[PDB]
Amino acid sequence: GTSNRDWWPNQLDLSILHRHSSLSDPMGKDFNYAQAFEKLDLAAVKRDLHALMTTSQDWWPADFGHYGGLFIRMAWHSAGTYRTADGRGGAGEGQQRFAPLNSWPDNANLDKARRLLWPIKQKYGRAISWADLLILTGNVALESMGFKTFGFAGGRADTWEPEDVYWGSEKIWLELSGGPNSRYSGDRQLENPLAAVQMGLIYVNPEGPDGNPDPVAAARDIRDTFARMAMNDEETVALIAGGHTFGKTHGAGPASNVGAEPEAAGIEAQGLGWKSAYRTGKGADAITSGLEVTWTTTPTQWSHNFFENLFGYEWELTKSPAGAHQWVAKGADAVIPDAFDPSKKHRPTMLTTDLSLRFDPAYEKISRRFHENPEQFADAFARAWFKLTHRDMGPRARYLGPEVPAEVLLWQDPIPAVDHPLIDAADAAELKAKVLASGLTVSQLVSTAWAAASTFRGSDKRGGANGARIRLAPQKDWEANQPEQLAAVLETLEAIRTAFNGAQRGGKQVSLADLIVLAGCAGVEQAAKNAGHAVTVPFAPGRADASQEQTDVESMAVLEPVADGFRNYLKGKYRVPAEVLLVDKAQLLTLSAPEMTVLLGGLRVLGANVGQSRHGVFTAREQALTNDFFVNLLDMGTEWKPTAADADVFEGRDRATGELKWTGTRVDLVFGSHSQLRALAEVYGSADAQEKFVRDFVAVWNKVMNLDRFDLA
Amino acid sequence: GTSNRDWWPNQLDLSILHRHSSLSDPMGKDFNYAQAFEKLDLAAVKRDLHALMTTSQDWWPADFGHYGGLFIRMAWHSAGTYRTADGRGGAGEGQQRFAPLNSWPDNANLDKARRLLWPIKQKYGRAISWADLLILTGNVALESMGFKTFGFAGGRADTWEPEDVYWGSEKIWLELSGGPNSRYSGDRQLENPLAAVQMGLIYVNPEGPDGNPDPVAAARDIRDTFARMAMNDEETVALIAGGHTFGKTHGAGPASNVGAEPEAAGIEAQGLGWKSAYRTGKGADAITSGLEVTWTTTPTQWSHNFFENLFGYEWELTKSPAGAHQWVAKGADAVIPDAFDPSKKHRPTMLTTDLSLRFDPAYEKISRRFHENPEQFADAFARAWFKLTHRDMGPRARYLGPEVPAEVLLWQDPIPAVDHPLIDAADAAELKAKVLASGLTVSQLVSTAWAAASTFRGSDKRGGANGARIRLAPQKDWEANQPEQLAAVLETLEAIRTAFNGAQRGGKQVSLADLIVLAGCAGVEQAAKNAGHAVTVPFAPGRADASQEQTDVESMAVLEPVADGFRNYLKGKYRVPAEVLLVDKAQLLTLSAPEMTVLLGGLRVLGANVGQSRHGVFTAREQALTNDFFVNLLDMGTEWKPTAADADVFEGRDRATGELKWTGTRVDLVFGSHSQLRALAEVYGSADAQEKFVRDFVAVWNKVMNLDRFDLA
Numbered sequence A, B: 001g002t003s004n005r006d007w008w009p010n011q012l013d014l015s016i017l018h019r020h021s022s023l024s025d026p027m028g029k030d031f032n033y034a035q036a037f038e039k040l041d042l043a044a045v046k047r048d049l050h051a052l053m054t055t056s057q058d059w060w061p062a063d064f065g066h067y068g069g070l071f072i073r074m075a076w077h078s079a080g081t082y083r084t085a086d087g088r089g090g091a092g093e094g095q096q097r098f099a100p101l102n103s104w105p106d107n108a109n110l111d112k113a114r115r116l117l118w119p120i121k122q123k124y125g126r127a128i129s130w131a132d133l134l135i136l137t138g139n140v141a142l143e144s145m146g147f148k149t150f151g152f153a154g155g156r157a158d159t160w161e162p163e164d165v166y167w168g169s170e171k172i173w174l175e176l177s178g179g180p181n182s183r184y185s186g187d188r189q190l191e192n193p194l195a196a197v198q199m200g201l202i203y204v205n206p207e208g209p210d211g212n213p214d215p216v217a218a219a220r221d222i223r224d225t226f227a228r229m230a231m232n233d234e235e236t237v238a239l240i241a242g243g244h245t246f247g248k249t250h251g252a253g254p255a256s257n258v259g260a261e262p263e264a265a266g267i268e269a270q271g272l273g274w275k276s277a278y279r280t281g282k283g284a285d286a287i288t289s290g291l292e293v294t295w296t297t298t299p300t301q302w303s304h305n306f307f308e309n310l311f312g313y314e315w316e317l318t319k320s321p322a323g324a325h326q327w328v329a330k331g332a333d334a335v336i337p338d339a340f341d342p343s344k345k346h347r348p349t350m351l352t353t354d355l356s357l358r359f360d361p362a363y364e365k366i367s368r369r370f371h372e373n374p375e376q377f378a379d380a381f382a383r384a385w386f387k388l389t390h391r392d393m394g395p396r397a398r399y400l401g402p403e404v405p406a407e408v409l410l411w412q413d414p415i416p417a418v419d420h421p422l423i424d425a426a427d428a429a430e431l432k433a434k435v436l437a438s439g440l441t442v443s444q445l446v447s448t449a450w451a452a453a454s455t456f457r458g459s460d461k462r463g464g465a466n467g468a469r470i471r472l473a474p475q476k477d478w479e480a481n482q483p484e485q486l487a488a489v490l491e492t493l494e495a496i497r498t499a500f501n502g503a504q505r506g507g508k509q510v511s512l513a514d515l516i517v518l519a520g521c522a523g524v525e526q527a528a529k530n531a532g533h534a535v536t537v538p539f540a541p542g543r544a545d546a547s548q549e550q551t552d553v554e555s556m557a558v559l560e561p562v563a564d565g566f567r568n569y570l571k572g573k574y575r576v577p578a579e580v581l582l583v584d585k586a587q588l589l590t591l592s593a594p595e596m597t598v599l600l601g602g603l604r605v606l607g608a609n610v611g612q613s614r615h616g617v618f619t620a621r622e623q624a625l626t627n628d629f630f631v632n633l634l635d636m637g638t639e640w641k642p643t644a645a646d647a648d649v650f651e652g653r654d655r656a657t658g659e660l661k662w663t664g665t666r667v668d669l670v671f672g673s674h675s676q677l678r679a680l681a682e683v684y685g686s687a688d689a690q691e692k693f694v695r696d697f698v699a700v701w702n703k704v705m706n707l708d709r710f711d712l713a
């Protein structure tokens, strides 16, 4: 059937804002996963997982009699889709079980691994999510094989439909770089927000870049992709050498033997894919990647044999039985065990990308250190494996169960514990009044609070107003935050804070993080008063102030809002139209289309625009909370045309006289163009809508202020 | 950005079951449109509409100084998308303002008409929906021009995103028949459920079939499409001649002057499209369809001139200024007024499809009768205009406001008013015990109540258990309803009914419609007891029994469930795969995917399959309400394969021994294959899920039993 996306392939897609409704969810409206998990007998689940590791099923026999290697790869790919640029991907939503991830070529035969876990999922039911179980299973694999993990946190709630993620523009799985939809340009520059080198890969091509088996060039792709997944050189070496201490690759015959990926397979396959016509299609005859490498002499036991082999041999370029490039140790004896035949042994083998850890000069120094000091290797790999598997879970307040590590890690963007009584309702009203008496304007108050709170993204649950990080590097210097204006507001608020805290008894105090939010609430209340409405904007205290020392400045960089349509801001010129970037930002903020619409219309008239731009400020009563943006936008007495200077800025002229009435951007005018957004704008632009507009604006402002308040979950 | 639909273009689309969530809706969850409408000053709206008619805007000037013709066309197209096959389309959801319909070529310049309405929509706000406004405006246009309408009902709630409708498979707007995606095969057979001859047309091509100007061949298409919109010959003739008593077509210059449709236009167009480079682009120079025809000597007044012209002249084939085929009266004087220039007059003109009303022999006889008896024409057009505009609104209980006609019409599928005391909870428990003591089985009671209730479709709000139409022709004879078994159950129920009604005092009685549903409920209670659960199924009395004379056998035919996955039934072999047909049926029933899943798993184990087919009956305790369907479907100890005799039936064998354990259809197996459905099946197939399954099954059973209960809304 032909669809709207076929007819108008470039129209903005709002359905990404309306995913994950209560319609698609099989659990009750009241189901609370954290409460279910808190009662799980986690020890009992782990003893079942342990037994599973060595209980081979004949429909996918276990290599070496042990599924450990398979399940470590399963959990590394569940986590390995993560991109720091947008926080999308990772293990936190269990998305490996849905399209497209369930059918990426890099995920071949992980369908088998997931199916092996159905009995345990079925036994424990809603008390352990698929998302948590994937990770836990990786942990238990490592434990069963003699590696002590750094810990585990539960709390990844299952999702029930595919996440909307940009994975690239290519129309061919694994397409080499340089095609009509190339993800590369310039001197091998990978486009943001991507974090893999080819469509359907986790990070890099195990043969080398675009198939070229040069370990030195492969190392450049590894470092770039890993950095785009928030991992540095030490973490990278530790993860790769750590993972490849276990198990094996599968390449026993030609890849043309392998049939359809799970989403294309016939109904009778019952959710599995990659059925192979090569000999038995499984076990000794398995074909997954097409490579056929077994790294260590004890693939089902933790050891330091990966680096002993890497450094102890010289390596020769060869081909697997499927024809893929790989490497074999020159002059070696047959010391590596066969996965099914106790009478056969094989020479050590390596991937091109393993050899990167020796042949890249910076990696070589880390790898030698780890080889010489295996205790350092084990500790780095444990900490890296934790980071890998938890990096998208958000603040530590979301971490559940008896195995959470006590050590606070910088990448967690830690927030200190609150150790004093909180302000009460009467205190909050006094603070709002003192903020308003200081001479701070509605515009300043709203803009500051918006800047602090709207760094949150629901993709990895980073950012938000908790921590008062807006006063720290780098946030205080971001152009979107208007650094000089910000410094003057913060100074005035910190004086209000000092005075209030100096007057208290009993240890009560207010954090700057809470006062920034509260002040923004006072602004919104005043703006409502300016329009004739008496409202109380809700406020929940309990945020704490983080220090510069607890703030990783480099990792914070990815939260910089280079496009923020809610402030009519675009840092530079991008290939993606500004309206698409607005809907992307709404998605990260967890906003529906109605919420996006209300919030944008309000922020325009409150004076939230960066630079005090007049674009979209369609009101003669700025700093009053009215529906004027929608009324004026929708007025057919105004005609709009792009300016000669800039086709992305529009002038709105009286249709009869020609007199200039307004100017707007694409972000402003999309609400009068897109047929679904225009239908929302019409609701708020109606004559009966001012009370509804105030209420819905206060609700969505409070939602935004609370996005990171997992302490109140 | 490449999406799952790009990778796997034939995968089943579940997002149709989760459209219209509370996420996309700008109204609060408690908003009740009928309550808002009931308070509207309808009189005031109509006065404003009357004023609008002659208040010409310079950006789309009114032909003849009166917009009535434009708004009549606007209302007729709002209604004219309706298909009796599935009940989808029509005016009832206001979908003309959304994609794709807002941009269909047949809707060209109706974006102007809708924008002319924005000031009235704005003024009255949520109290009148766009959906109602579009039809009311049509009505007012008719009244302003001298035509007395039969009535008007409000209550069409606005919707907030595009409806999921199959409009055809063609990839080119207006493609002529016989292309790679042809909607025609055989001897001009249009594929169901379509009701238009080309992609982007309302019904037929005004030049003639595929552009060939033959009025007698055009009449065949007119009769087929209009029948597929629930209109017969008399209604058809009355609507076409009635509509074309007013206004004009627009074809002043070549169509190459006209630019992009609304969904393709630049953001500065602010929701409008078809901007024209021909002269002033509007008014006297307007180009809409390309035809240039004005039918009557008084285009802004009701008259009998359509038929006087049609019969009074002989017609000659000519071309408009855009090159389109149309007809001109031989030897006539210049009697038809110009829309803008008082000094020009034109000869009478007609479309090919107008001439069909004279040159088709059955239409000719109706047209002559209307010509000779103008009162009869007036009454039939008033009735047909009401039907056109209300055919998708459902039962009379949904009709709101002071203009609703008192006359009950057959196409409304009328149900008599209840005129007696209803049964109470004590009576319901007595009746259920009598039903269970009769010897009727769980399978019989469930299957009958399912058959009665599952005729409902939310697309046009036809069908459901109200009316006890399952005892009448044609429902009693449908193969899916098992006529012999149905008759034996109805006989036993009607004996129970007679005995209970004979024992009452006052006028209390129970209808058969209620008893059918109540007996189904007793069967579900019994099945739950059979599984060891104590469950009371909710029941709401108040359904009444319709007569055969209130039940139009021909219009009931479209509700026949030729595919019903919930009974594992398929009447014949179809081009659409059975799982697609199940999701389509779930959509019509208003079910989400979790509801569809629970419902289907319960019906399988309760013995609801047509013919007592064993396909999908994955239980050894049939007639007990358990989650067996899910537990056995998801068991990896079974391997499935299509049978040699029939690739659409699958055998499930023990993986170790080869022994046959079950058989299933595509409808059964999709729940173990599609990755999102399998995730839902897993929830209900878990060890902790038996109580949840029972309770979610009762809820969705009750939902279905109440789909048509607008007497209780």
Ligand code: HEM
Binding pocket: A063, A068, A069, A070, A072, A073, A076, A203, A204, A205, A206, A222, A239, A240, A242, A243, A244, A246, A247, A248, A249, A250, A251, A287, A288, A289, A290, A291, A353
């Ligand atoms: C440059 C980065 C990496 C590359 C290119 C890569 C490549 C691969 C490939 C091609 C396979 C074989 C798939 C098959 O045929 O079965 C594989 C296996 C595996 N990888 Fe990696 N890998 C990388 C990093 C990782 C990391 C970070 C981990 C975990 C810490 C990991 C753990 C494993 C394990 C355990 C297996 C063995 C699976 C089994 O026994 O079935 N690898 N790797």
Ligand code: HEM
Binding pocket: B063, B068, B069, B070, B072, B073, B076, B203, B204, B205, B206, B222, B239, B240, B242, B243, B244, B246, B247, B248, B249, B250, B251, B287, B288, B289, B290, B291, B353
């Ligand atoms: C075979 C069925 C019909 C065909 C092929 C058809 C075709 C058309 C076409 C091609 C136009 C010109 C559009 C333009 O260029 O502006 C039009 C105009 C119109 N039609 Fe129809 N029509 C049909 C039935 C209907 C019915 C059932 C009604 C209403 C009861 C109706 C009422 C109108 C009116 C009022 C106009 C004039 C619009 C104006 O003044 O701007 N027609 N028709």
Ligand code: NA
Binding pocket: A087, A088, A089, A090, A092, A392, A458, A459, A460
């Ligand atoms: Na994420």
Ligand code: NA
Binding pocket: B087, B088, B089, B090, B092, B392, B459, B460
């Ligand atoms: Na409909």
